Paper text:
In the case of Sqt1, we were able to decipher the mode of L10-N peptide binding by X-ray crystallography. These structural analyses showed that the C-terminal domain of Sqt1, which is preceded by a non-essential N-terminal extension of ∼50 amino acids, folds into an eight-bladed WD-repeat β-propeller.
To this end, we also performed in vitro binding assays with the orthologous proteins from the thermophilic, filamentous ascomycete Chaetomium thermophilum (ct), whose proteins often exhibit improved biochemical properties. As a first step towards the elucidation of the recognition mode of the N-terminal residues of Rpl10 by the predicted β-propeller domain of Sqt1 at the atomic level, we independently determined the crystal structure of ctSqt1 at 1.94 Å by molecular replacement and of ctSqt1.52C, lacking the dispensable N-terminal extension, at 1.5 Å resolution by single-anomalous dispersion (SAD) followed by molecular replacement using the ctSqt1.52C Se-Met structure as the search model. While the N-terminal extension could not be resolved, the crystal structures revealed that residues 52–533 of ctSqt1 form a typical eight-bladed WD-repeat β-propeller; thus, being composed of eight blades that each contain four β-strands and showing the characteristic ‘velcro' closure owing to the presence of the N-terminal β-strand as the outermost β-strand of the eighth blade. Sqt1 and ctSqt1 share a high degree of overall structural conservation and mainly differ in three ctSqt1-specific insertions located in the loops connecting β-strands 1c-1d, 5c-5d and 7c-7d. Analysis of the electrostatic properties revealed that both β-propeller structures notably contain a negatively charged top surface, whereas the bottom sides exhibit a charge-mixed surface.
Author numbering: 54 to 105, 127 to 223, 228 to 331, 366 to 466, 489 to 540
The structure:
């Protein structure tokens, strides 16, 4: 019924976004809508989960005149907290986390509003370019900013998509940024100019891969909604309408060709994740299923988990980076859905060539009752999961790998 060990009910309506500090997993920001009126503002909070039953915020994020839709702490060390709204506002806060005193301080620095609606954030993982963030917007544009020193630098502003930019993902080296659109296009941007210097950019001078609706072998009718890049940076996966997934080659810094096409599930692929260390790709669908493909076997189907979240949308799937049982590295997947449940899966099973349900966490309302889980973070080890719900609640769950035996 309710597996949570703590909660936060301060949001007045849908909690759309959540971010976790990269060094301090107890520091989590949540953001969403304060109501359904046309003029309802957005609101965010910063929480300290180490206090985990009712949580009290350590900071409040004000200034958004519409729902907060995106949050991120910057890489590598969370120097900034950035909020992004349906008002197009990007608000930048400096973060200080004193190992001495009672910790976290947050200071507003700047606001940028180059678009009307922010759809997503993705921090750049390049160690060479700290505190760099990308976003995609409803006008199809993709912006890359660096937070340094006019504290907001514009690194890139791209206008290649012609419809809403629905998702973005960096390559692991942080040199490429892959984004997708409702208009069915994929563009992979040479953000820092490295590919251009190696004569690996397309005719438009900006991308290393550009595929659109005119490319018949690529076109996914109804649009693209998710994107993920493999751990070696060798391929990008895009997911879209009708359960379709396309695998496209990237240059290593071969490029732009379709290496595999998939369509096992029946509705929008809303979430895609490559395992960080097992040769598998997981896809979550609006139809409630998760599908697992073997990346070293032409993306053969390993397992089709029908009803992973009943017949409600699978909103997010994400691999546990460093599970307590080191032997399970790369094989443990956490998912959340509009059924109001968070689940974790052991993906070793299935057809691997030459259920797997591990744990369920309940507490949110289902979509049918006005809830649904819209997002989560789970730290490095997956042992503490913090959720955001359409039922305006934030929950904290634990995996309990440490039994504290006597």
């Amino acid at each position: 019924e309710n597996d949570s060990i703590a909660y936060f009910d301060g949001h007045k309506d849908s909690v759309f976004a959540i971010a976790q500090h990269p060094l301090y997993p107890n520091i989590v920001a949540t953001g969403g809508s304060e109501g359904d009126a046309d003029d309802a503002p957005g609101k965010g909070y910063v929480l300290d989960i180490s206090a985990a039953t009712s949580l009290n915020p350590i900071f409040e994020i004000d200034g958004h005149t519409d729902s907060i839709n995106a949050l991120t702490f910057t890489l590598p060390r969370g120097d900034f907290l950035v909020s992004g709204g349906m008002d197009g506002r990007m608000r930048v806060y400096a973060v200080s986390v004193p190992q001495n005193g009672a910790l976290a301080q947050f200071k507003f620095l700047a606001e940028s509003q180059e678009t009307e609606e922010i759809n997503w954030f993705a921090p750049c993982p390049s160690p060479d370019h700290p505190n760099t963030i990308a976003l995609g917007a409803s006008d199809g544009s993709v912006w890359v900013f660096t937070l340094d020193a006019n504290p907001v630098q514009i690194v890139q502003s791209y206008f290649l998509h012609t419809g809403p930019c629905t998702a973005g993902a960096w390559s692991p080296d942080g040199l490429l940024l892959a984004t997708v659109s409702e208009d069915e296009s994929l563009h992979v941007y040479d953000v820092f100019g490295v590919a251009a210097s190696k004569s690996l950019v397309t005719d438009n001078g900006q991308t290393v891969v550009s595929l659109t609706n005119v490319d018949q072998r690529f076109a996914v009718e109804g649009g693209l909604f998710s994107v993920a890049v493999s751990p070696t940076g060798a391929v990008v996966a895009v997911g879209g309408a009708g359960g379709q997934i396309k695998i496209v080659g990237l240059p290593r810094l071969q490029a732009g060709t379709i290496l595999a096409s998939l369509q096992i599930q029946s509705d929008n692929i809303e979430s895609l994740a490559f395992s960080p260390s097992a040769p598998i790709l997981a896809a979550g669908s609006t139809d409630g299923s998760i599908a697992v493909f073997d990346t070293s076997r032409s993306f053969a189907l390993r397992r089709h988990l029908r009803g992973a979240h009943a017949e409600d949308p699978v909103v997010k799937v994400e691999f546990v980076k460093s599970p307590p049982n080191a032997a399970m590295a790369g094989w443990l997947l956490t998912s959340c859905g509009m059924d109001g449940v968070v689940r974790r899966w052991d993906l070793r099973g299935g057809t691997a060539g030459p259920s797997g349900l591990v744990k369920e966490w309940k507490g949110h309302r289902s979509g049918q009752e006005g809830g649904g889980v819209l997002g989560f973070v789970q730290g490095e080890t997956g042992e503490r999961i913090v959720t955001v719900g359409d039922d305006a609640v934030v929950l904290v769950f634990e995996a309990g790998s440490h039994h504290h035996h006597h």
